[PDB]
Amino acid sequence: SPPSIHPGKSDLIVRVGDEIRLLCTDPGFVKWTFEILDETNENKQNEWITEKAEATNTGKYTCTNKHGLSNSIYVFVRDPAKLFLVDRSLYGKEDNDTLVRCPLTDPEVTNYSLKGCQGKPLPKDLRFIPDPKAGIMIKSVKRAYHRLCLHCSVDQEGKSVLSEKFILKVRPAFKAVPVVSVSKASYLLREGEEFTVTCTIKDVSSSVYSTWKRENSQTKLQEKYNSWHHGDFNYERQATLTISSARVNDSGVFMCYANNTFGSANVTTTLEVVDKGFINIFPMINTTVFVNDGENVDLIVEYEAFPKPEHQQWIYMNRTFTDKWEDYPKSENESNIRYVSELHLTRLKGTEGGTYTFLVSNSDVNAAIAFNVYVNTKPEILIRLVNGMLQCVAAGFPEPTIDWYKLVVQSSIDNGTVECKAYNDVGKTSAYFNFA
Amino acid sequence: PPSIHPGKSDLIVRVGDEIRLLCTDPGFVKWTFEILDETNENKQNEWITEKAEATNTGKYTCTNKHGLSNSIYVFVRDPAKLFLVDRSLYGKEDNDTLVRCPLTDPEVTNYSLKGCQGKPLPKDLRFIPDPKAGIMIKSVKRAYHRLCLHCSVDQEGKSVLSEKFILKVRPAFKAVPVVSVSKASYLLREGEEFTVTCTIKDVSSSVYSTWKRENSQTKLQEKYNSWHHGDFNYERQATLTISSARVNDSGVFMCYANNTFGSANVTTTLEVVDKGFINIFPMINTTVFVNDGENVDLIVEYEAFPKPEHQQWIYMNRTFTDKWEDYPKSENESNIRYVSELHLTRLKGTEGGTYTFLVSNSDVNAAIAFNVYVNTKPEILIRLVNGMLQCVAAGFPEPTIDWYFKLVVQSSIDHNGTVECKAYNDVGKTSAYFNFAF
Amino acid sequence: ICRNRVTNNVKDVTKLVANLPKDYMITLKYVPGMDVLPSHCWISEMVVQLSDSLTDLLDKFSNISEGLSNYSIIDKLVNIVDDLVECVKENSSPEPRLFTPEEFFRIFNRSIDAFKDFV
Amino acid sequence: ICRNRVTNNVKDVTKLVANLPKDYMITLKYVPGMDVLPSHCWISEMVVQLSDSLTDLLDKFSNISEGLSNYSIIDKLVNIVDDLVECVKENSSKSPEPRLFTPEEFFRIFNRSIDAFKDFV
Numbered sequence A: 001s002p003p004s005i006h007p008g009k010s011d012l013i014v015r016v017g018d019e020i021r022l023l024c025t026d027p028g029f030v031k032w033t034f035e036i037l038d039e040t041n042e043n044k045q046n047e048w049i050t051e052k053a054e055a056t057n058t059g060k061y062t063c064t065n066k067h068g069l070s071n072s073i074y075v076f077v078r079d080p081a082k083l084f085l086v087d088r089s090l091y092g093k094e095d096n097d098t099l100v101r102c103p104l105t106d107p108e109v110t111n112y113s114l115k116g117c118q119g120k121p122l123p124k125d126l127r128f129i130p131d132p133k134a135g136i137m138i139k140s141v142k143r144a145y146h147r148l149c150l151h152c153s154v155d156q157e158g159k160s161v162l163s164e165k166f167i168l169k170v171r172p173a174f175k176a177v178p179v180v181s182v183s184k185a186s187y188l189l190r191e192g193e194e195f196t197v198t199c200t201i202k203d204v205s206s207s208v209y210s211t212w213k214r215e216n217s218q219t220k221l222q223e224k225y226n227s228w229h230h231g232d233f234n235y236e237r238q239a240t241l242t243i244s245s246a247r248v249n250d251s252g253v254f255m256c257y258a259n260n261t262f263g264s265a266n267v268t269t270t271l272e273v274v275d276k277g278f279i280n281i282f283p284m285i286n287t288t289v290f291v292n293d294g295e296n297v298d299l300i301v302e303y304e305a306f307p308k309p310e311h312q313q314w315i316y317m318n319r320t321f322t323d324k325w326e327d328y329p330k331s332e333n334e335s336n337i338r339y340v341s342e343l344h345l346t347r348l349k350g351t352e353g354g355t356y357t358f359l360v361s362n363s364d365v366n367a368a369i370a371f372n373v374y375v376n377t378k379p380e381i382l383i384r385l386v387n388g389m390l391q392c393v394a395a396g397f398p399e400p401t402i403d404w405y406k407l408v409v410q411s412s413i414d415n416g417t418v419e420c421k422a423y424n425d426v427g428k429t430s431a432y433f434n435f436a
Numbered sequence B: 001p002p003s004i005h006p007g008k009s010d011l012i013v014r015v016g017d018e019i020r021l022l023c024t025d026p027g028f029v030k031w032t033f034e035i036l037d038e039t040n041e042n043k044q045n046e047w048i049t050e051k052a053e054a055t056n057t058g059k060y061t062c063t064n065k066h067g068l069s070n071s072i073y074v075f076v077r078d079p080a081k082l083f084l085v086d087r088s089l090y091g092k093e094d095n096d097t098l099v100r101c102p103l104t105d106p107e108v109t110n111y112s113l114k115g116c117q118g119k120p121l122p123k124d125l126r127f128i129p130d131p132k133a134g135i136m137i138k139s140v141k142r143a144y145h146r147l148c149l150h151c152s153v154d155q156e157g158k159s160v161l162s163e164k165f166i167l168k169v170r171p172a173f174k175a176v177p178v179v180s181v182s183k184a185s186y187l188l189r190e191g192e193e194f195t196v197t198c199t200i201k202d203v204s205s206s207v208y209s210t211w212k213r214e215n216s217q218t219k220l221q222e223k224y225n226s227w228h229h230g231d232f233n234y235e236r237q238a239t240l241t242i243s244s245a246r247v248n249d250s251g252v253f254m255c256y257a258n259n260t261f262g263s264a265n266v267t268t269t270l271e272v273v274d275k276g277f278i279n280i281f282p283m284i285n286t287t288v289f290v291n292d293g294e295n296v297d298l299i300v301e302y303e304a305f306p307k308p309e310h311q312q313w314i315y316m317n318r319t320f321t322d323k324w325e326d327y328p329k330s331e332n333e334s335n336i337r338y339v340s341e342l343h344l345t346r347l348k349g350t351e352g353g354t355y356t357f358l359v360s361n362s363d364v365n366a367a368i369a370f371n372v373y374v375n376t377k378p379e380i381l382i383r384l385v386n387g388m389l390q391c392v393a394a395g396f397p398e399p400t401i402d403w404y405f406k407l408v409v410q411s412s413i414d415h416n417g418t419v420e421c422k423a424y425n426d427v428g429k430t431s432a433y434f435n436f437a438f
Numbered sequence C: 001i002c003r004n005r006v007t008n009n010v011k012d013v014t015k016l017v018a019n020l021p022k023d024y025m026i027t028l029k030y031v032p033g034m035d036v037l038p039s040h041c042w043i044s045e046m047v048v049q050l051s052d053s054l055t056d057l058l059d060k061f062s063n064i065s066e067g068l069s070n071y072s073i074i075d076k077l078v079n080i081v082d083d084l085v086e087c088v089k090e091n092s093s094p095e096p097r098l099f100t101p102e103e104f105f106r107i108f109n110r111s112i113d114a115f116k117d118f119v
Numbered sequence D: 001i002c003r004n005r006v007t008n009n010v011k012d013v014t015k016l017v018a019n020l021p022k023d024y025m026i027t028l029k030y031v032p033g034m035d036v037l038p039s040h041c042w043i044s045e046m047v048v049q050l051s052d053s054l055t056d057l058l059d060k061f062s063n064i065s066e067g068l069s070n071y072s073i074i075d076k077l078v079n080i081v082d083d084l085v086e087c088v089k090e091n092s093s094k095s096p097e098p099r100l101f102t103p104e105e106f107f108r109i110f111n112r113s114i115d116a117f118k119d120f121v
């Protein structure tokens, strides 16, 4: 059998100040236990007495015995002074029920209730169940109720009486994954230079876990961390990674990686480390070009270079060229490695052909490329009488061809007239002499 | 002249003792009593008190029928309160000032002045006692500003301290006010809202500042902002506006400030116009000669208000375009001179003709025209009929043909033969050689 | 007159009232009936009393470099309240009593707003 | 462990001290001898008490939008300490007498309490 407690009723009221006297009748007596809230006490006498007053005595009394036997009795000490016993701690996990420790020292009251501070009314959605032995319980605590502040309240003699004051706090359950962003995108460096890259995380909570790791290896690198709380349920972290001095081995994928109890995400970036620097050149047109008098031509180069260009120059026939040319990057992106220059020859006069050359410099390399130029000219023609033979003389790049009816061509001949005519792709011209 | 009992120059009395007097005159009028601010007059020629309080301490004066008078000054020993104090303190820069620390029990020594919270006094505050009242500080100077003081005696070898005093000083003006205006000068089309601001910086709020219409005596409406920027550093801004300008509102406006050291003034000018305008000046003569393959540029300075809103170039009624630059002629804050140039390089012969440049703003549009002749060396030709040799040349100027052996000219001349026509105009030379054989 | 000694720093007073504990206590030697007309009788004594109490409130805080501070705002209030004493005293002790800041500053602003209308 | 829950904001504590009246009074239940004994004894009770006291203090100020009101700073510090409580209650897994402190000292006690985590079993 369990042990018998005298008197055997479930519950007892006692005056503040009155004596409290409880006996447990079992051959197997072992123990007395006393519990309220988190306070706890034990006794090894088989009888429990306390002549003095304390309200705090209120709560639960338990007796236990040899074969395993146990019985309990519950007790009130009615105090007009102390209607509640209280504990100002209050915390809830999102989406679970939560308990407010304001259990009642005298059960003979009604309209046992929960109420909002300073007159302000409680949000409508709360539903809660009371109990005098525990205090009062709030269902399904949800993110609206954060920092909400509370009284629990009772009516005695029609007068309405209030607990000491409570502030509720809620800690969130993750509905969604971390959010991950990286300071700049992809990196290229001349050897033996410091390398520094930053990764940033926005998330609901300070509990989030985040790391840097290098592709194909699990050595965690050294990293340094900084954080801010931008308001409720709003947490931010930044992490920075550094290599003081690059060696070419350092090239490859790097990954910023984040995790919480809902799932995960990353961002990747790639570093290329190069030993030295280069300039590489491509013409937009064939290197040698053919153009008519007063015609117009533009010459173009596209080139890839690192480090950045030091100067471009444009020069002709042991002489300068000046102020008829443009040079600008092929793209505005931070990544930009590629560059173009164009140079105009316009209303080109017929003798100015020859060789046009472009030169470019950077810190490590110099590179030069040349174009050659020949002029389409309409035939230009002239006459010289030699002995008995009459000669017809004409020049143009490319050669003129002649009929009777710079390259130089000559034609020699064996009432009315001698007409001598030459044609080229560029134009035609002619000569006249006559006999009577 | 009056007689007072007892007849010493003071009396010294225990706390609680009844204080007893008669002002002795047939010419009695009153007793007159005061110290610090508090003051009393009473009509009894005896003067009597039930029991001496510290607050009775001070000067008493027997008031009489000539206005002849006599005074006796009275002290009460009272071991709680050696000091009586007025907490208020102010000093005019570089005068002396008096510190309200009169003393109840004139039997103590070493009586002197000391820093708050154990700090030292700055070394220069030469100071003088008079236990009849206070301590005096000479020649207060601006470094003492919001300094903190205690007032102190050695008594029974103990050291005894007043409550705090905190010392605040009014500046006196070394220099004239310093003045700036929001921008120098203005032009407005009629009716626009017009607004200006004037700025003053000085040591005090008591600087005086006004706006006057130039050569007119009457104050206009103005509105104010001011800040204390820390110690001895005060700033004021004043703003003046006309909501809508009639033309007669043109002229000059002045901002003017005065202070006991002197005065400073700054001035700004305004012109209001009934309309916009545009005016144009060429670089070069309207009509211009060039030669084939040479280069020429066409250049205009023009001044305009409001700002230029369309600018366009056309040649032979068609848009010869995109060899031209235009920019404001100056970077000064109110420049309205503008320059544009148009640049022509390796001009070709047939292209001679007519060129026009044109501007509009909202109010007005205006256009100027140029005409150009490119000269050339002559070309030449040969014809014949009726046994005439015909030689024909065209160019600029009219070319000249001599025979030896678009301006247009011709001539003719009537066994084996070679004769020729050899020619130049101003621009150049060419030769035409004939051969006609039996 | 004296309508110019009052620089526009006063707008900061509403900021200052926010940044002080609502239960802190301030001590002022209050003219009885300052809550009733006219202006002119109480205003003369009142500006003196205000200068004293403000001076001691300035003694509490400490100076700080970056962003506004209570110390900074209080200082400029003292400079104004002094100038008005010089103006009134050269143009023209009630019991110590305790106030929370909101009550006190209600008094202060009413006092300033008595100027900009005067004899 | 838990060291990452203390965001860097704590530097603001020096600003906050300067703007509170040097004779305002702040109220704490203070663990006796906590100045003396090794950290791991007192820390558990102390960190609870701080969170309580601070949430009381927060009622006293009023928010403004411009700049750094005291109300802003205090609101953030509460968020730090609560998650330390959870971290200890979940990773480690009697009431003193009430006591009064001037601001400077009180924050000193707080600051040393934070420092105890930068190396803790």
Ligand SMILES: *[C@@H]1O[C@H](CO)[C@@H](O[C@@H]2O[C@H](CO)[C@@H](O)[C@H](O)[C@H]2NC(C)=O)[C@H](O)[C@H]1NC(C)=O
Pocket (backbone or CB within 6 Å): A209, A259, A260, A261
């Ligand atoms: C995300 O989070 C947890 C930790 O919060 C990861 O747990 C791993 O647990 C083992 C030991 O049991 C550790 O050695 C690992 O370091 C942890 N993993 C990582 C990547 O650090 C868990 O593996 C992660 N993934 C998921 C789905 O929860």
Ligand SMILES: *[C@@H]1O[C@H](CO)[C@@H](O[C@@H]2O[C@H](CO)[C@@H](O)[C@H](O)[C@H]2NC(C)=O)[C@H](O)[C@H]1NC(C)=O
Pocket (backbone or CB within 6 Å): A265, A266, A268
């Ligand atoms: C970031 O973490 C996960 C797991 O490594 C990767 O998830 C992959 O994403 C792509 C695109 O959605 C899918 O096609 C794959 O099936 C996912 N799983 C795997 C094993 O790749 C994610 O892409 C990761 N990192 C990188 C560099 O992609």
Ligand SMILES: *[C@@H]1O[C@H](CO)[C@@H](O[C@@H]2O[C@H](CO)[C@@H](O)[C@H](O)[C@H]2NC(C)=O)[C@H](O)[C@H]1NC(C)=O
Pocket (backbone or CB within 6 Å): B256, B263, B264, B265, B266
């Ligand atoms: C307005 O400004 C000018 C320059 O500050 C003042 O012009 C001087 O006036 C005095 C006579 O009053 C002349 O002797 C000076 O030669 C003037 N020039 C300078 C540089 O001092 C003028 O006095 C000012 N007027 C007012 C009313 O303020």
Ligand SMILES: *[C@@H]1O[C@H](CO)[C@@H](O)[C@H](O)[C@H]1NC(C)=O
Pocket (backbone or CB within 6 Å): B208, B258, B259, B260, B261, B262
């Ligand atoms: C300053 O202001 C008033 C008004 O114009 C004038 O009477 C006075 O002469 C000016 N100069 C000085 C030193 O006050």
